[PDB]
Symmetry: D2
Subunit: 723 residues, 4 copies
Amino acid sequence: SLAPSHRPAAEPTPPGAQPTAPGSLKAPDTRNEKLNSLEDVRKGSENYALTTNQGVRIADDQNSLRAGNRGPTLLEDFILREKITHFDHERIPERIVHARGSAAHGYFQPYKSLSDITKADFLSDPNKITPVFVRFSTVQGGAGSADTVRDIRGFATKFYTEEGIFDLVGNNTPIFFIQDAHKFPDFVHAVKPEPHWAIPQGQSAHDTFWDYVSLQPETLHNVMWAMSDRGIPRSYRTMEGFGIHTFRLINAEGKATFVRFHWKPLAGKASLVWDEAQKLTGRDPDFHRRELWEAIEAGDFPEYELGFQLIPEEDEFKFDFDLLDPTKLIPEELVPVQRVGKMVLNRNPDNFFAENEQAAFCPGHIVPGLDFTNDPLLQGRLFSYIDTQISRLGGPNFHEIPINRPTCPYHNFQRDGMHRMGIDTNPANYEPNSINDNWPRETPPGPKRGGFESYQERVEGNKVRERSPSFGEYYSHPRLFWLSQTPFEQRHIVDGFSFELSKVVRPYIRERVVDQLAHIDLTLAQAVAKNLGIELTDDQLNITPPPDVNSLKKDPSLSLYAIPDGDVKGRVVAILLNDEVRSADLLAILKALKAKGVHAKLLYSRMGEVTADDGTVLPIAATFAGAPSLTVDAVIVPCGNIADIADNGDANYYLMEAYKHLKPIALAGDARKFKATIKVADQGEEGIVEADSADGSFMDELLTLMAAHRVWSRIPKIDKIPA
Amino acid sequence: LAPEDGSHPAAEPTPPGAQPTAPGSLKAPDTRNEKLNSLEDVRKGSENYALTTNQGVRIADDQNSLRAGNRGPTLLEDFILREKITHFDHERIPERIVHARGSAAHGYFQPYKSLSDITKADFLSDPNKITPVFVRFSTVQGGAGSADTVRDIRGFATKFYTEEGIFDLVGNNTPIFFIQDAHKFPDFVHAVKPEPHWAIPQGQSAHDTFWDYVSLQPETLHNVMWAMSDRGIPRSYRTMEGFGIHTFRLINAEGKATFVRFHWKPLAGKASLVWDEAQKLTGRDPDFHRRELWEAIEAGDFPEYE
Amino acid sequence: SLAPEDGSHRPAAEPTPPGAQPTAPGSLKAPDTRNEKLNSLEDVRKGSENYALTTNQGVRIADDQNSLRAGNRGPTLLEDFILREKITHFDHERIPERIVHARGSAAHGYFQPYKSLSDITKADFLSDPNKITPVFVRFSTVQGGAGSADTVRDIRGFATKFYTEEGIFDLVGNNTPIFFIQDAHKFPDFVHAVKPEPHWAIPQGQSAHDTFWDYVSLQPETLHNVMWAMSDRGIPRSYRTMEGFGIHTFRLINAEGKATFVRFHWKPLAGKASLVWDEAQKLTGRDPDFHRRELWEAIEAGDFPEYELGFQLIPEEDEFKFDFDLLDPTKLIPEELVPVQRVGKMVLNRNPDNFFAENEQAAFCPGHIVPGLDFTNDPLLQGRLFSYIDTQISRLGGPNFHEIPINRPTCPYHNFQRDGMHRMGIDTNPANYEPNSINDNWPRETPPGPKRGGFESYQERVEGNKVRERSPSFGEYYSHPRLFWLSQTPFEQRHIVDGFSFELSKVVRPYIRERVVDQLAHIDLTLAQAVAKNLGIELTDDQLNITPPPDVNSLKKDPSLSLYAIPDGDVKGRVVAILLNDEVRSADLLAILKALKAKGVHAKLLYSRMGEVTADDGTVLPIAATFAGAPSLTVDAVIVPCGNIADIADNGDANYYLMEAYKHLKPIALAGDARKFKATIKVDQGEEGIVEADSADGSFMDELLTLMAAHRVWSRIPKIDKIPA
Amino acid sequence: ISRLGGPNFHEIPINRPTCPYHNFQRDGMHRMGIDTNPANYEPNSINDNWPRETPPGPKRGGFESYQERVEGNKVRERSPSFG
Ligand code: HEM
Ligand code: HEM
Ligand code: HEM
């Protein structure tokens, strides 16, 4: 039964280099106080006897107890029943939303004290290090759904602070679909698989979603973000995070500052294109989950900068949108994002179910120095996140699940509940009590280590179910977003709408959405209608565009690519081998990739080994079909016996796929024969790196393109290629 | 809000893509059996009803929370909002430990002739005797949100509502299983399932722990052969075979026992995908088998098994 | 700043007698009392002192008196996360109670054997006299809910969790040596019958209703455990003063693979004592927590409950030697034919910190055995093994109930089991399956062996057809009820007659009553006639002519089946009520207390009011309770010293206390003028069980302590019918 | 939710309304009602928005809260008129 190696090195290694491992085995020296506090419940395996859950050693784990070798199984086999019972009861309900997610451990620290605007301990001192645990997610799909769907993305961060847990539960877009939490089930029911037949998974491309959008135009701003490349990010490390709601900062004087929370990716913003993303759901449904785990094992740590948009209290009415409306964004041109701190994810969990699946985040989990607002999406969220944990995690003691426990002290009069772990020794389970001298005791609010006290906001109104008239404007933020995109991003937004509405069965629904788009931008409205064979009426062509947002004609922070921010580190290249590789070419590629921290996968028509011309032996990471171009950032072909792969269907298709997906391609020497497969002229073109050998010049070319992420000049050429 | 022309489905058989898909009782009201009729008491309508709370209270405004003024904080006393969010917060139940991904439909079974000579099972007692059935088809490894056209075994579970009790014939699309003794089911299932540290990969046996177990346990090799074949990727649930796998007994009036193995034969015959096609289809439509089953029944192309 | 300045809120971490101080959780009450299970639980204990009050998330609370509201007189706000967490946790405090034995009381302890038993069993916990195993014990009733009374007429549960080096062993016993039914398949039928009736959910903690006696009448296998229940066994004085039994035959397995049949016995070192029914039924009113209280206080006092573990042992070749089937759980093995040899001592020396965390969540299953023990085909026991693991999935909310701290082994546990609700363990194992190469197949199987071996079943021969059929060897029902009956003292026999009579009187349909009586004619005619006469039923001539059942392997009687035939009394941990007056004779009270302290007997000082009285000599006496506040029901004996007797002589409650104690057969001691009370209980030369003297002479204290040693004054029974109490 | 094991406790018979009850709520543990509504959300056009909001009225109207004036600051504070 035994080992041969099976075991990965406990050192950073590149994707595919070694087998993946639990984080504590892979990187045992990677520590924070949260990671150390979990040692209590880590269970080892090596050199341990196999037992029952009651600690009884098992002699034979291959057989049921039966009356004779060929007899019936006996009721008295308690070893079998315990093992089957635990297996029969493994699953718990998945999250109603964001069921699909991937998580890792990390730490956060401030650049500088923010005591000026908040008395929150974790932002108080730039040498206090706060452990974090982060789950990224899709929204619509099940836990068993694909990563690279066209969906919103969740970005939930739990801070273990010295004065409590703070959960910042954000999405990768700065707004949300709906204004009031009362409509969350109608919206989620409409985007979810349809109730009769439970189709489709991880997709908004169905009737009930576009029906709801057509009748609820408050939706159109977050729809625009979804139909754009924001909807299909290259990686969790390459997307933005937003709190979405206005929130409050409270300082020691009781001054209230409005804030919006930002996460800025230091790896920069990168998205897929739709054909690649849709297909990547087939070839690797786990592509984001995997990219993340390997990036962290490789040492390419996900890094984010915390950003505040800050508005003083007297400025609440200064925009022509309402700050508490969560379908409106605050343009960075009006209010800039101030860098606050850095977050670094430097270690994977040990057990996915134990740590990721049971992790409970709540936007209500705030600390003194923060507070809420009357944003009515957020007001409703506060109730839900606690309510849902009672069924999902089997009771009100979900905070004693180890991933969830505070690192700081927690003492109160709360008692019992299912799976109670804490044994209280306090004579009293009530306050006020004399029998324990009233311990544990209330704490008055103060600058530091004070009890939580709400900001004393003035409330004046009647009890109403009424939407604020200040919320009833729906088109100007969709148009501000549209006008802020690069033409090629605009082309991608047109295509998202075109593709999803093309899957809508009822045409009256497709025509309705085209009418809303006319209220945003007639250029966009006419590009979508032409793709659906709809024709705008005169009334539609004469619809007046929405106002500017505070005189803004465009905001470039709203585009993924308008301002370059690309960093190549942690990206991967595909190298397509032949049976006699020119070692000179491969030597130089690997040295240039390594100096910039770019990983490579060596691929052939078969697994195992090939030999280079100087007799070096190359292990093959995957075949062409086994790891298609979908999975790499660029493609390199070195020289050798090119004839070996020149007539290979899979080798040819790999370049055609990458080319269609606008990826940089590098051909060395004879590999230029390959330019025929992708119909490139001898002179070549931008996006196709070519040379007699892979020189210093050749690798600089490849790496500069990789920094720009994709080759957008290629788009006019891609419609003709079949792939 | 409906279109004036009523183009928002016809209650008659229509081909795939022709009209929007609908619940079975709306699509085909004149299709009945005894089980479907017995379910009328729990069927809820919608047309002509006031929107209410679960307590039967009529809702005036379903677009808003109750708040202290227009831009006010939401109030705890809003029982209509809390009931709605609470029910939403509690929609999910645990999925099946195995065969979480599945698609089902209502049907009927009749025996060609009486089988009294070999079993006293009432549902096999007279020719043309109608027993209602409910059938669920499934993969094995994937969750409820995973793709239909994966490489896997397929489940073929039939619920027979007989005059003398429920008989569940719980079958697979191959005639053997991976393992000999039930004691090792959790070992085998943990092996083919997504790996415990990082929960990768979904709906595939193409990872180390599945083949490490197969390599150390050669009883697995017969079902592995079926799985590595085109049997592992059926073109349709309509186009695969069904098997009970175990030997059971038939018992007759006289108390005589006959060993038996169960088969389902598809009248539409055996057809499969090819791997590159099936892997891409998990991308282009992960609901392909679910959709096809549903549209085949709306079209009148009924899954028929012997 | 709320505690009193004299520090009277805090109890002393010293052994103190019942009522001396507030009761505390065990780790505060007795911090120096330790064992491996209790040391292992330190990691989950929460303190309180000098802690800020927070949310479960660690956020400090400024104001725990108020909900957040839009104004002073405003509506409450959804955004109040501190309110909702607090209420939410409160709204989800309760979990399902146990289907049976929902009412229970528990304590930590340790077990030690007298000598190595490694000749007959390879169980590590019996391997050496110096091997000390932590235990947690829960005693219970059966029928009632968690909120029902302790001193009901019912069976008591005696479940013991041994945390051994080679795994948890749960010995899940009852306080009688048999059960009501032969086959597990009928457990719900029998439990449904004794339980409250399904239409109106009546009655609680009582077998005295129609559906129970209907089931008994139609299932005579029940009659042997019913006799025990209708006896004084059904209402024990304390959990410390009852026997425990395994009930099933189990197996011992030694290193050679030799199998020895065993039946388990707990023998109480404090001896066997029981209430009488009138006292027991009344005590469910005066103190429904009486057993639970008595047990916590005995332990806080140092009066540690002690039991001796006993084995009845039968060679395998001896399986068919008796007149009854060893696998039949409605038959006992008489101590005359097979003796109990002493195996070890169990001592319960610490109370729990939190009743819900440790008692309510504790899970026992008789299927929890270790290498060196094994099952038999006892068809009641075969059925129990399925049920105890099935029930925990709902009751403890998932398959991870073993990770709840009380339930955790002290010994190591490693397997390929993963996930489930409230999963605590974070597995680092690359493999969640075996066989695996990726972790070198760890953790690994262990072959069976003399020490630290893997568990392997005894290779018992099985031959026969798949049948649902009761063994004809089980089909005898009357001879063990008869053996039990003839083994009882005549005063125990009347108590049995009165139990049947009282319970059947409650049965609304008379034919049910007549059928139970007809069953009794089959056990013994004397018992059968005494019941019929209390029910105004007349036995027919057929009934008068029923031939008695065989005796059991030639035994006319076994006296180990009687609570009292062979005395085993120990007065340590008993309680006397002392009835004060406003000018107590100091000399009497001084002598009384020093005599009780010397024998470890506790006292409570009672008056017509609370606070303090002054003795004749100026001594200040504090008052524990009023006569109504702590009635005679709650004590073993009553002592009235001399003084200003006139003060209490015409007190209604003071006279009733003497009459209640007297009717219930308790020892009563009167000094000096206190003798004038002899008139209320119609006693002058005096009688057995009334100790009287000019003063509390010390001979007087010797006479009283001797009576207490015999527990009750049985000679008194003929006199108590006259007394209206 | 914990005591009767999910959000469908209104479908336990003794708990059931005798009046009609229709909404967009779906699923939950032990769901008894099989909904035939093509829509599980509103506003919808696919079912013509059934079931529908009812305006408040003297008889058979929708529930609307009494429009009580709220004036105060957010406080955890006990009315001195209570003391
Ligand atoms: C501002 C818009 C929203 C954002 C950014 C947001 C963010 C998130 C995120 C990131 C998660 C996944 C957390 C995790 O990984 O465990 C989540 C889950 C959830 N959200 Fe939201 N959410 C939003 C709106 C809402 C609304 C309006 C509701 C209304 C009730 C809601 C209820 C929930 C629930 C019930 C879960 C599942 C909780 C669990 O099982 O732990 N969300 N949300
Ligand atoms: C020949 C071997 C087997 C076959 C053909 C088989 C077949 C099936 C099928 C078709 C289902 C899906 C039922 C549905 O549609 O809901 C299923 C579910 C399941 N099977 Fe198996 N199975 C086999 C072996 C096992 C074994 C050995 C175990 C456990 C020891 C097991 C445990 C389960 C469980 C727990 C489920 C989930 C069912 C539920 O939640 O209701 N199966 N099986
Ligand atoms: C001689 C026969 C039996 C004895 C001596 C016995 C003993 C006990 C005891 C002492 C307890 C309480 C354990 C505790 O304090 O937590 C108990 C509980 C229980 N017994 Fe039995 N029992 C017997 C027969 C049965 C049978 C036949 C069944 C079912 C097949 C059964 C099912 C249960 C269940 C479900 C509980 C509650 C389980 C739990 O929540 O832990 N018992 N039994």
